[PDB]
């Protein structure tokens, strides 16, 4: 299990002087989502290419890449266009095996959202997969938060830090939700956190979101 975030280690939105729209968009309406596809190509050792039009999926390692080539898979996640290379669009992880992983209805996972330690609200996200990627769930989660709680706005964010914690049975892991300090967000660097292709079992996952205000 990933241990919790140390003090300071969480990124701060007031130490980001670039444009929060650079992050908001990764969790806006547009995203990649394809059902029952197989890879037609491979740029580097750690990636696979799909036509969905061209999407290059990059894993953290070869074993993953090799694992899902020549497999029919579902593909879901957040993509980017800038500093993206096939030598068309790029993403990390977000792959799951299609056959044997499908539910005929949607599971609901409750997301619990806290602010300065208080209970802010709860809402559900939906998934028709037995096993689903944390990336998918994160994006369903943040998306709702962007439409409804102004989590990311064009210029800045009303929250100071924020992380998203996933607990299944008794293991847990977390993502920082704020861009690293400086005057310019890099989408490709941020999104790399999802290249381990982490999977959770939908029947069992709990999700909690922890935001502070400034």
């Amino acid at each position, epitope marked *: 299990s990933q*241990p*919790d*975030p*140390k*003090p300071d280690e969480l990124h701060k939105s007031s130490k980001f002087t670039g444009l929060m729209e650079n992050m908001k968009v990764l969790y806006d309406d547009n995203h990649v989502s394809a059902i029952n596809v197989k890879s037609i190509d491979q740029f580097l050792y750690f990636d696979l290419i799909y036509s969905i039009d061209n999407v290059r999926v990059e894993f953290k390692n070869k074993d993953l890449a090799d694992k899902y080539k020549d497999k029919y898979v579902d593909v879901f996640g957040a993509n980017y266009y800038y500093q993206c290379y096939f030598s068309k669009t790029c993403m990390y992880g977000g792959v799951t095996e299609h056959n044997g992983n499908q539910l005929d209805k949607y599971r609901s996972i*409750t997301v*619990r959202v*806290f602010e*300065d*330690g*208080k*209970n802010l609200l*709860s809402f559900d996200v939906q998934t028709n997969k037995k096993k689903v990627t944390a990336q998918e769930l994160d994006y369903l989660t943040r998306h709702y938060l962007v439409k409804n709680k102004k989590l990311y706005e064009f210029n800045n964010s009303p929250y*100071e*830090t924020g*992380y998203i*914690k996933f*607990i299944e*049975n*008794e293991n*847990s892991f977390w993502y920082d939700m704020m861009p690293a300090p400086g005057d310019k967000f890099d989408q490709s660097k941020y999104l790399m956190m999802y290249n381990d292709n982490k999977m959770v079992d939908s029947k069992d996952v*709990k999700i*909690e979101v*922890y935001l*502070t205000t400034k």
Partner: antibody
Framework: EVNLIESGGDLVKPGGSLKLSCATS????????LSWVRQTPERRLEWVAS???????YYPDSVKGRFTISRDTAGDILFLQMNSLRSEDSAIYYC??????????????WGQGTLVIVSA | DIVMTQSPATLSVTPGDRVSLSCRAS??????LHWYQQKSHESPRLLIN???QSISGIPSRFSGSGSGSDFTLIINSVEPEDVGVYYC?????????FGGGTKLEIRR
């Protein structure tokens, strides 16, 4: 493992002051809702004070202005300073921690507590 | 404040029976209601969070239901080791409040 070891319980006079402590270990200290809950001699539990991972403090009307919860982030010590104590403040005072993270209303780990008696 | 009221004050159960404890709140609190068990000479222990979401390590004979103002803790096949006092808590909004406890007693 998650340890919570309260100390500082004592007998005090009506109107006096006491400092309670909670040496914690086995978890990242700054990442958790930490609270004090007390047990009255009639066996009521009452929420007394909470501190969020991020330093926000909360109190019930009946202790505000008299009680202060705080953290020593170097030493992992959770403190409850209590001023102007009343007979009604007599109880077992428990240190508590959230189950998963920054949420101050779910008591998943409890210390063995520490007796406070306010009496002449 | 939100007043939690537990029912009944005392239960007297035979080991093996399926038993039920009730908690009514004065306003709706969604499912931000948690359940605790306290045994003699011991600290309280969290049994159930969010009305029904269970907790790693708790025997699965404890379960909860309800939402809004009415909640229920079920103890399936009670064991003699279950004697003690059981509390519900408003974790929804301030001030967080606790119900006044329900004492469980065993028959022999």
């Amino acid at each position: 493992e998650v340890n919570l070891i309260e100390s500082g319980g004592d007998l005090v006079k009506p109107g006096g002051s006491l400092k309670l402590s909670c040496a914690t270990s086995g978890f990242t200290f700054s990442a958790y809702g930490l609270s004090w809950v007390r047990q009255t001699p009639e066996r009521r539990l009452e929420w007394v004070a909470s501190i969020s991972g991020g330093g926000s403090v909360y109190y019930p009307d009946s202790v505000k202005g008299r009680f202060t919860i705080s953290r020593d982030t170097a030493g992992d010590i959770l403190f409850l300073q209590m001023n102007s104590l009343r007979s009604e403040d007599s109880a077992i005072y428990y240190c508590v921690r959230d189950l998963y993270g920054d949420y101050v209303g779910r008591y998943a780990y409890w210390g063995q507590g520490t007796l406070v008696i306010v009496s002449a | 404040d939100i007043v939690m009221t537990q029912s009944p004050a005392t239960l007297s159960v035979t080991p093996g029976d399926r038993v039920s404890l009730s908690c009514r709140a004065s306003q709706s609190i969604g499912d931000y209601l948690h359940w605790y068990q306290q045994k003699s000479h011991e600290s309280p222990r969290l049994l159930i969070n969010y009305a029904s979401q269970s907790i790693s390590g708790i025997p699965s004979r404890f379960s909860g239901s309800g939402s809004g103002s009415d909640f229920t803790l079920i103890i399936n096949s009670v064991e003699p080791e279950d004697v003690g006092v059981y509390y519900c808590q408003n974790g929804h909004s301030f001030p967080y409040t606790f119900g006044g406890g329900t004492k469980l007693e065993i028959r022999r």
